Amino acid sequence: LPEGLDDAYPMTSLQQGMLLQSEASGDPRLLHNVVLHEVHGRLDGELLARAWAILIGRHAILRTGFDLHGGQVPLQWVHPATAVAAEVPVHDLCGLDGETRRLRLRAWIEEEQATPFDWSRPPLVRLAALALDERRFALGVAEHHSVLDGWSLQSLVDELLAVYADLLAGVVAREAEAPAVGFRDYVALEREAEANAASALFWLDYLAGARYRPLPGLAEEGPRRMAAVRVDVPADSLSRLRALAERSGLPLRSLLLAAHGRALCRFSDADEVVTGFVSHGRPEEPGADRLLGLFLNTLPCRLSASVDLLDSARRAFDYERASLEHRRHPLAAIRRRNRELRLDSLFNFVDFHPAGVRHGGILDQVVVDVDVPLAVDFEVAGERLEVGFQYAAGRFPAERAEALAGAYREALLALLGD
Ligand code: NA
Ligand code: NA
Ligand code: NA
Ligand code: NA
Ligand code: NA
Ligand code: NA
Cα(365) to centroid of ligand 6, in Å? Predict the structure, then answer.
Protein backbone atom coordinates (compact mmCIF):
# COMPACT_ATOMS: atom_id res chain seq x y z
CA LEU A 1 0.00 0.00 0.00
CA PRO A 2 1.60 3.29 -1.12
CA GLU A 3 1.97 6.34 1.10
CA GLY A 4 -0.08 9.44 0.46
CA LEU A 5 -3.54 7.90 0.07
CA ASP A 6 -6.56 9.61 1.54
CA ASP A 7 -7.92 6.17 2.50
CA ALA A 8 -8.08 2.48 1.57
CA TYR A 9 -10.75 -0.11 2.33
CA PRO A 10 -12.20 -3.26 0.79
CA MET A 11 -14.09 -3.49 -2.44
CA THR A 12 -17.77 -4.48 -2.07
CA SER A 13 -18.96 -7.85 -3.32
CA LEU A 14 -20.70 -6.21 -6.27
CA GLN A 15 -17.56 -4.19 -7.13
CA GLN A 16 -15.52 -7.40 -6.99
CA GLY A 17 -17.95 -9.51 -8.99
CA MET A 18 -18.33 -6.94 -11.71
CA LEU A 19 -14.58 -6.49 -12.12
CA LEU A 20 -14.00 -10.24 -12.07
CA GLN A 21 -16.68 -10.55 -14.69
CA SER A 22 -14.94 -7.89 -16.79
CA GLU A 23 -11.54 -9.52 -16.34
CA ALA A 24 -12.92 -12.93 -17.32
CA SER A 25 -14.44 -11.38 -20.43
CA GLY A 26 -11.86 -9.64 -22.36
CA ASP A 27 -14.30 -7.00 -23.56
CA PRO A 28 -14.05 -3.35 -22.56
CA ARG A 29 -17.73 -2.93 -23.54
CA LEU A 30 -19.03 -5.13 -20.69
CA LEU A 31 -20.72 -3.13 -17.93
CA HIS A 32 -19.48 0.04 -19.71
CA ASN A 33 -22.08 2.82 -19.57
CA VAL A 34 -21.81 5.72 -22.02
CA VAL A 35 -24.26 8.63 -22.22
CA LEU A 36 -24.44 11.94 -24.10
CA HIS A 37 -26.32 14.82 -22.41
CA GLU A 38 -27.51 17.95 -24.17
CA VAL A 39 -26.41 21.10 -22.34
CA HIS A 40 -27.80 24.53 -23.23
CA GLY A 41 -25.07 27.06 -22.68
CA ARG A 42 -21.73 28.39 -23.81
CA LEU A 43 -19.02 25.74 -23.80
CA ASP A 44 -15.87 26.86 -21.96
CA GLY A 45 -13.62 23.82 -21.83
CA GLU A 46 -11.31 25.14 -19.13
CA LEU A 47 -14.21 26.04 -16.82
CA LEU A 48 -15.75 22.58 -17.44
CA ALA A 49 -12.49 20.84 -16.52
CA ARG A 50 -12.31 23.09 -13.44
CA ALA A 51 -15.85 22.02 -12.47
CA TRP A 52 -14.81 18.36 -12.84
CA ALA A 53 -11.75 18.93 -10.65
CA ILE A 54 -14.08 20.38 -8.01
CA LEU A 55 -16.28 17.27 -8.07
CA ILE A 56 -13.20 14.99 -8.01
CA GLY A 57 -12.10 16.74 -4.82
CA ARG A 58 -15.51 16.27 -3.22
CA HIS A 59 -16.14 12.54 -3.84
CA ALA A 60 -13.92 9.65 -2.77
CA ILE A 61 -15.23 7.28 -5.46
CA LEU A 62 -13.95 9.64 -8.18
CA ARG A 63 -10.39 9.39 -6.73
CA THR A 64 -10.56 5.64 -6.28
CA GLY A 65 -8.56 2.92 -7.95
CA PHE A 66 -9.37 -0.77 -7.67
CA ASP A 67 -6.71 -3.33 -6.75
CA LEU A 68 -8.28 -6.74 -7.34
CA HIS A 69 -5.28 -9.02 -6.77
CA GLY A 70 -2.45 -6.98 -5.22
CA GLY A 71 -3.25 -7.63 -1.56
CA GLN A 72 -4.98 -10.47 0.26
CA VAL A 73 -8.40 -8.83 -0.13
CA PRO A 74 -9.47 -6.60 -3.06
CA LEU A 75 -9.00 -3.01 -1.99
CA GLN A 76 -10.29 0.41 -2.96
CA TRP A 77 -7.44 2.96 -2.95
CA VAL A 78 -8.64 6.57 -2.42
CA HIS A 79 -5.96 8.86 -3.89
CA PRO A 80 -5.54 12.55 -2.91
CA ALA A 81 -7.12 15.10 -5.22
CA THR A 82 -3.62 16.44 -6.02
CA ALA A 83 -2.87 13.06 -7.60
CA VAL A 84 -6.06 12.80 -9.71
CA ALA A 85 -6.15 14.56 -13.06
CA ALA A 86 -9.29 16.39 -14.21
CA GLU A 87 -9.48 15.97 -18.00
CA VAL A 88 -12.39 16.93 -20.24
CA PRO A 89 -11.51 16.51 -23.97
CA VAL A 90 -13.29 19.02 -26.17
CA HIS A 91 -14.51 18.01 -29.63
CA ASP A 92 -15.87 20.32 -32.30
CA LEU A 93 -19.01 19.28 -34.18
CA CYS A 94 -20.07 22.83 -35.06
CA GLY A 95 -21.35 23.57 -38.52
CA LEU A 96 -22.37 20.01 -39.40
CA ASP A 97 -25.72 18.97 -40.78
CA GLY A 98 -28.14 17.02 -38.62
CA GLU A 99 -27.46 13.50 -39.74
CA THR A 100 -23.68 14.00 -39.74
CA ARG A 101 -23.86 15.35 -36.17
CA ARG A 102 -25.98 12.40 -35.06
CA LEU A 103 -23.47 10.02 -36.64
CA ARG A 104 -20.51 11.76 -35.07
CA LEU A 105 -22.26 11.59 -31.68
CA ARG A 106 -22.88 7.86 -32.19
CA ALA A 107 -19.25 7.40 -33.18
CA TRP A 108 -18.04 9.05 -29.96
CA ILE A 109 -20.24 6.60 -28.00
CA GLU A 110 -19.01 3.47 -29.77
CA GLU A 111 -15.37 4.47 -29.62
CA GLU A 112 -15.62 5.21 -25.88
CA GLN A 113 -17.52 1.98 -25.25
CA ALA A 114 -14.63 0.08 -26.87
CA THR A 115 -12.01 1.91 -24.75
CA PRO A 116 -10.89 -0.03 -21.68
CA PHE A 117 -10.40 1.36 -18.20
CA ASP A 118 -7.16 1.36 -16.22
CA TRP A 119 -8.51 0.27 -12.83
CA SER A 120 -5.56 1.81 -10.99
CA ARG A 121 -5.84 5.28 -12.57
CA PRO A 122 -8.71 7.38 -11.26
CA PRO A 123 -11.08 8.86 -12.06
CA LEU A 124 -12.93 5.72 -13.28
CA VAL A 125 -15.40 8.11 -14.88
CA ARG A 126 -14.56 9.83 -18.19
CA LEU A 127 -16.02 13.06 -19.55
CA ALA A 128 -16.00 14.76 -22.91
CA ALA A 129 -17.67 17.86 -24.33
CA LEU A 130 -18.78 17.94 -27.94
CA ALA A 131 -19.55 21.49 -29.19
CA LEU A 132 -22.73 21.39 -31.30
CA ASP A 133 -23.39 25.08 -31.97
CA GLU A 134 -22.66 28.36 -30.19
CA ARG A 135 -25.38 27.76 -27.57
CA ARG A 136 -25.31 23.97 -27.20
CA PHE A 137 -22.87 21.15 -26.44
CA ALA A 138 -23.05 17.46 -25.61
CA LEU A 139 -21.55 16.26 -22.36
CA GLY A 140 -20.32 12.69 -22.61
CA VAL A 141 -20.23 10.66 -19.41
CA ALA A 142 -18.84 7.14 -19.24
CA GLU A 143 -18.08 4.75 -16.42
CA HIS A 144 -17.97 1.10 -15.50
CA HIS A 145 -21.00 -0.06 -13.50
CA SER A 146 -18.58 -0.97 -10.70
CA VAL A 147 -18.16 2.76 -9.97
CA LEU A 148 -21.61 4.42 -9.96
CA ASP A 149 -25.23 3.36 -9.70
CA GLY A 150 -27.89 5.31 -11.62
CA TRP A 151 -28.80 7.56 -8.70
CA SER A 152 -25.13 8.48 -8.17
CA LEU A 153 -24.76 9.13 -11.90
CA GLN A 154 -27.69 11.53 -11.86
CA SER A 155 -26.30 13.31 -8.78
CA LEU A 156 -22.90 13.56 -10.46
CA VAL A 157 -24.28 15.10 -13.64
CA ASP A 158 -26.51 17.55 -11.74
CA GLU A 159 -23.65 18.65 -9.48
CA LEU A 160 -21.19 19.04 -12.40
CA LEU A 161 -23.62 21.28 -14.26
CA ALA A 162 -24.39 23.32 -11.09
CA VAL A 163 -20.67 23.88 -10.43
CA TYR A 164 -20.09 24.68 -14.10
CA ALA A 165 -22.95 27.19 -14.15
CA ASP A 166 -21.46 28.82 -11.05
CA LEU A 167 -18.08 29.18 -12.74
CA LEU A 168 -19.64 30.40 -15.98
CA ALA A 169 -21.58 33.09 -14.06
CA GLY A 170 -18.40 34.15 -12.22
CA VAL A 171 -19.49 33.09 -8.73
CA VAL A 172 -17.82 30.74 -6.29
CA ALA A 173 -18.81 27.11 -6.70
CA ARG A 174 -21.22 26.27 -3.95
CA GLU A 175 -21.11 23.01 -2.00
CA ALA A 176 -23.70 20.96 -0.14
CA GLU A 177 -23.36 20.16 3.56
CA ALA A 178 -20.84 17.38 4.15
CA PRO A 179 -22.71 14.09 4.69
CA ALA A 180 -22.27 12.27 7.96
CA VAL A 181 -21.25 9.02 6.33
CA GLY A 182 -18.98 8.07 3.43
CA PHE A 183 -18.75 5.16 1.06
CA ARG A 184 -16.45 3.39 3.53
CA ASP A 185 -19.38 3.20 5.93
CA TYR A 186 -21.48 1.37 3.30
CA VAL A 187 -18.62 -1.09 2.85
CA ALA A 188 -18.66 -1.84 6.57
CA LEU A 189 -22.46 -2.22 6.55
CA GLU A 190 -22.24 -4.79 3.75
CA ARG A 191 -19.44 -6.80 5.39
CA GLU A 192 -21.45 -7.01 8.60
CA ALA A 193 -24.54 -8.03 6.65
CA GLU A 194 -22.57 -10.66 4.75
CA ALA A 195 -21.50 -12.06 8.11
CA ASN A 196 -24.99 -11.86 9.62
CA ALA A 197 -26.22 -15.41 10.25
CA ALA A 198 -29.90 -14.55 10.57
CA SER A 199 -29.71 -12.79 7.20
CA ALA A 200 -28.04 -15.71 5.48
CA LEU A 201 -30.66 -18.01 6.99
CA PHE A 202 -33.49 -15.72 5.97
CA TRP A 203 -32.48 -15.99 2.34
CA LEU A 204 -31.97 -19.78 2.57
CA ASP A 205 -35.43 -20.24 4.07
CA TYR A 206 -37.05 -17.82 1.60
CA LEU A 207 -35.79 -19.77 -1.41
CA ALA A 208 -36.46 -23.30 0.01
CA GLY A 209 -38.64 -25.06 -2.55
CA ALA A 210 -38.12 -22.52 -5.30
CA ARG A 211 -37.67 -23.78 -8.85
CA TYR A 212 -35.56 -22.05 -11.46
CA ARG A 213 -37.12 -22.88 -14.78
CA PRO A 214 -35.34 -20.91 -17.54
CA LEU A 215 -37.14 -18.00 -19.14
CA PRO A 216 -39.14 -19.65 -21.95
CA GLY A 217 -37.61 -18.80 -25.32
CA LEU A 218 -34.23 -17.93 -23.83
CA ALA A 219 -31.42 -19.92 -25.42
CA GLU A 220 -28.91 -21.54 -23.08
CA GLU A 221 -26.03 -20.21 -25.20
CA GLY A 222 -25.53 -17.36 -27.63
CA PRO A 223 -23.41 -14.33 -28.48
CA ARG A 224 -23.50 -10.99 -26.61
CA ARG A 225 -25.83 -8.53 -28.35
CA MET A 226 -28.10 -6.06 -26.54
CA ALA A 227 -31.50 -4.65 -27.48
CA ALA A 228 -34.12 -2.53 -25.79
CA VAL A 229 -37.90 -2.38 -25.95
CA ARG A 230 -40.31 0.22 -24.60
CA VAL A 231 -43.62 -0.99 -23.22
CA ASP A 232 -46.74 0.81 -24.49
CA VAL A 233 -47.84 2.08 -21.11
CA PRO A 234 -51.58 2.92 -20.95
CA ALA A 235 -52.45 6.58 -21.26
CA ASP A 236 -52.50 8.05 -17.78
CA SER A 237 -51.09 5.18 -15.78
CA LEU A 238 -49.00 7.05 -13.25
CA SER A 239 -51.85 9.23 -12.06
CA ARG A 240 -54.31 6.36 -12.00
CA LEU A 241 -51.81 4.08 -10.26
CA ARG A 242 -50.76 6.62 -7.63
CA ALA A 243 -54.45 6.94 -6.78
CA LEU A 244 -54.90 3.19 -6.51
CA ALA A 245 -51.76 3.23 -4.36
CA GLU A 246 -53.02 5.82 -1.86
CA ARG A 247 -56.49 4.29 -1.61
CA SER A 248 -55.33 0.70 -1.12
CA GLY A 249 -52.45 1.44 1.26
CA LEU A 250 -49.97 -0.27 -1.08
CA PRO A 251 -46.96 1.68 -2.40
CA LEU A 252 -46.56 2.20 -6.14
CA ARG A 253 -43.45 0.02 -6.23
CA SER A 254 -45.52 -2.90 -4.87
CA LEU A 255 -48.22 -2.50 -7.52
CA LEU A 256 -45.58 -2.43 -10.27
CA LEU A 257 -43.69 -5.41 -8.83
CA ALA A 258 -46.93 -7.42 -8.87
CA ALA A 259 -47.39 -6.33 -12.49
CA HIS A 260 -43.90 -7.51 -13.30
CA GLY A 261 -44.71 -10.86 -11.71
CA ARG A 262 -47.99 -11.19 -13.60
CA ALA A 263 -46.32 -10.36 -16.89
CA LEU A 264 -43.58 -12.88 -16.28
CA CYS A 265 -45.85 -15.71 -15.07
CA ARG A 266 -48.25 -15.26 -17.99
CA PHE A 267 -45.50 -14.92 -20.61
CA SER A 268 -43.64 -17.90 -19.16
CA ASP A 269 -46.86 -19.91 -18.53
CA ALA A 270 -45.57 -20.51 -15.00
CA ASP A 271 -47.07 -20.77 -11.53
CA GLU A 272 -44.11 -18.84 -10.08
CA VAL A 273 -41.06 -16.96 -11.27
CA VAL A 274 -37.93 -15.96 -9.39
CA THR A 275 -36.79 -12.47 -10.42
CA GLY A 276 -34.10 -10.14 -9.13
CA PHE A 277 -35.34 -7.21 -7.08
CA VAL A 278 -32.81 -4.35 -7.24
CA SER A 279 -32.56 -2.61 -3.86
CA HIS A 280 -30.19 0.01 -2.49
CA GLY A 281 -28.41 -0.22 0.84
CA ARG A 282 -27.28 3.39 1.29
CA PRO A 283 -26.63 3.94 5.01
CA GLU A 284 -29.72 5.26 6.79
CA GLU A 285 -27.89 8.40 7.85
CA PRO A 286 -28.19 12.11 7.02
CA GLY A 287 -26.94 13.06 3.55
CA ALA A 288 -26.48 9.45 2.40
CA ASP A 289 -28.59 10.34 -0.62
CA ARG A 290 -25.80 12.67 -1.79
CA LEU A 291 -23.03 10.02 -1.71
CA LEU A 292 -21.53 8.80 -4.99
CA GLY A 293 -20.80 5.12 -5.46
CA LEU A 294 -22.39 1.71 -6.06
CA PHE A 295 -25.01 0.85 -3.41
CA LEU A 296 -27.12 -1.77 -5.22
CA ASN A 297 -27.80 -5.35 -4.21
CA THR A 298 -30.06 -7.67 -6.19
CA LEU A 299 -32.38 -9.78 -4.06
CA PRO A 300 -34.15 -12.98 -5.05
CA CYS A 301 -37.87 -12.33 -5.27
CA ARG A 302 -40.49 -15.05 -5.74
CA LEU A 303 -43.63 -13.94 -7.53
CA SER A 304 -46.48 -16.42 -7.78
CA ALA A 305 -49.33 -16.34 -10.27
CA SER A 306 -52.71 -15.08 -9.07
CA VAL A 307 -56.07 -14.07 -10.51
CA ASP A 308 -56.28 -11.47 -7.69
CA LEU A 309 -53.65 -8.97 -8.77
CA LEU A 310 -54.25 -6.76 -5.74
CA ASP A 311 -53.49 -9.70 -3.45
CA SER A 312 -50.28 -10.18 -5.48
CA ALA A 313 -49.49 -6.53 -4.76
CA ARG A 314 -50.04 -7.11 -1.06
CA ARG A 315 -47.68 -10.07 -1.14
CA ALA A 316 -45.08 -7.99 -2.98
CA PHE A 317 -45.41 -5.39 -0.22
CA ASP A 318 -45.06 -8.06 2.45
CA TYR A 319 -41.94 -9.33 0.64
CA GLU A 320 -40.30 -5.91 0.71
CA ARG A 321 -41.13 -5.51 4.39
CA ALA A 322 -39.84 -8.93 5.39
CA SER A 323 -36.66 -8.65 3.31
CA LEU A 324 -35.81 -5.07 4.31
CA GLU A 325 -33.44 -5.73 7.19
CA HIS A 326 -31.73 -8.47 5.14
CA ARG A 327 -31.31 -6.42 1.98
CA ARG A 328 -27.56 -5.83 2.36
CA HIS A 329 -26.70 -9.55 2.52
CA PRO A 330 -24.93 -9.73 -0.86
CA LEU A 331 -26.39 -11.76 -3.71
CA ALA A 332 -23.04 -13.52 -4.20
CA ALA A 333 -23.22 -14.78 -0.61
CA ILE A 334 -26.78 -15.99 -1.18
CA ARG A 335 -25.51 -17.83 -4.25
CA ARG A 336 -22.60 -19.34 -2.31
CA ARG A 337 -25.11 -21.15 -0.10
CA ASN A 338 -27.66 -21.80 -2.82
CA ARG A 339 -25.97 -22.94 -5.99
CA GLU A 340 -29.28 -23.62 -7.75
CA LEU A 341 -30.30 -19.96 -7.60
CA ARG A 342 -30.53 -18.37 -11.02
CA LEU A 343 -32.17 -15.06 -11.89
CA ASP A 344 -32.99 -14.55 -15.58
CA SER A 345 -34.83 -11.27 -15.00
CA LEU A 346 -34.40 -8.14 -12.88
CA PHE A 347 -36.91 -5.60 -11.58
CA ASN A 348 -35.66 -2.02 -11.17
CA PHE A 349 -37.96 0.73 -9.82
CA VAL A 350 -36.44 4.15 -10.53
CA ASP A 351 -37.71 7.28 -8.79
CA PHE A 352 -35.23 10.21 -9.13
CA HIS A 353 -37.51 13.26 -9.01
CA PRO A 354 -34.19 27.40 -14.47
CA ALA A 355 -32.41 30.21 -16.30
CA GLY A 356 -28.89 30.09 -17.66
CA VAL A 357 -27.12 26.75 -18.13
CA ARG A 358 -29.63 23.92 -18.38
CA HIS A 359 -29.64 20.20 -19.07
CA GLY A 360 -31.70 19.57 -22.18
CA GLY A 361 -32.22 15.80 -22.30
CA ILE A 362 -30.27 12.77 -23.50
CA LEU A 363 -29.00 12.86 -27.07
CA ASP A 364 -27.77 9.22 -27.35
CA GLN A 365 -26.56 6.38 -25.13
CA VAL A 366 -25.63 2.68 -25.20
CA VAL A 367 -27.72 -0.28 -24.20
CA VAL A 368 -25.18 -1.51 -21.70
CA ASP A 369 -23.68 -4.92 -22.46
CA VAL A 370 -24.58 -6.98 -19.39
CA ASP A 371 -24.91 -10.75 -18.85
CA VAL A 372 -28.36 -10.77 -17.18
CA PRO A 373 -30.87 -11.96 -19.81
CA LEU A 374 -33.73 -9.53 -19.04
CA ALA A 375 -33.63 -6.30 -17.05
CA VAL A 376 -36.89 -4.40 -16.60
CA ASP A 377 -37.00 -0.71 -15.62
CA PHE A 378 -40.09 0.92 -14.14
CA GLU A 379 -39.30 4.67 -14.16
CA VAL A 380 -41.15 7.65 -12.72
CA ALA A 381 -39.95 10.32 -15.16
CA GLY A 382 -41.81 13.60 -14.74
CA GLU A 383 -45.53 12.98 -14.54
CA ARG A 384 -45.11 9.80 -16.61
CA LEU A 385 -44.60 6.12 -15.89
CA GLU A 386 -42.01 4.74 -18.31
CA VAL A 387 -41.59 0.96 -18.55
CA GLY A 388 -39.01 -0.82 -20.68
CA PHE A 389 -36.47 -3.61 -20.66
CA GLN A 390 -33.13 -4.58 -22.13
CA TYR A 391 -32.43 -8.14 -23.17
CA ALA A 392 -29.78 -10.43 -24.62
CA ALA A 393 -30.84 -10.34 -28.28
CA GLY A 394 -28.18 -12.96 -28.91
CA ARG A 395 -30.19 -15.35 -26.70
CA PHE A 396 -33.82 -14.14 -26.78
CA PRO A 397 -35.76 -13.86 -30.06
CA ALA A 398 -37.12 -10.38 -30.75
CA GLU A 399 -40.52 -11.94 -31.41
CA ARG A 400 -40.56 -13.21 -27.81
CA ALA A 401 -39.45 -9.80 -26.51
CA GLU A 402 -42.39 -8.18 -28.27
CA ALA A 403 -44.66 -10.84 -26.80
CA LEU A 404 -43.25 -10.07 -23.35
CA ALA A 405 -43.88 -6.35 -23.84
CA GLY A 406 -47.54 -7.16 -24.58
CA ALA A 407 -47.71 -9.07 -21.32
CA TYR A 408 -46.42 -6.02 -19.43
CA ARG A 409 -49.01 -3.81 -21.12
CA GLU A 410 -51.72 -6.33 -20.24
CA ALA A 411 -50.54 -6.39 -16.63
CA LEU A 412 -50.65 -2.62 -16.28
CA LEU A 413 -54.16 -2.60 -17.77
CA ALA A 414 -55.26 -5.29 -15.31
CA LEU A 415 -54.07 -3.01 -12.50
CA LEU A 416 -56.21 -0.14 -13.75
CA GLY A 417 -59.24 -2.33 -14.43
CA ASP A 418 -60.61 -0.98 -17.71
NA1 NA B 1 -30.25 2.47 -10.71
NA1 NA C 1 -27.85 9.42 -16.65
NA1 NA D 1 -46.40 -3.13 -25.64
NA1 NA E 1 -48.36 -13.59 -22.56
NA1 NA F 1 -26.07 0.64 -28.09
NA1 NA G 1 -48.28 7.83 -17.49
Answer: 23
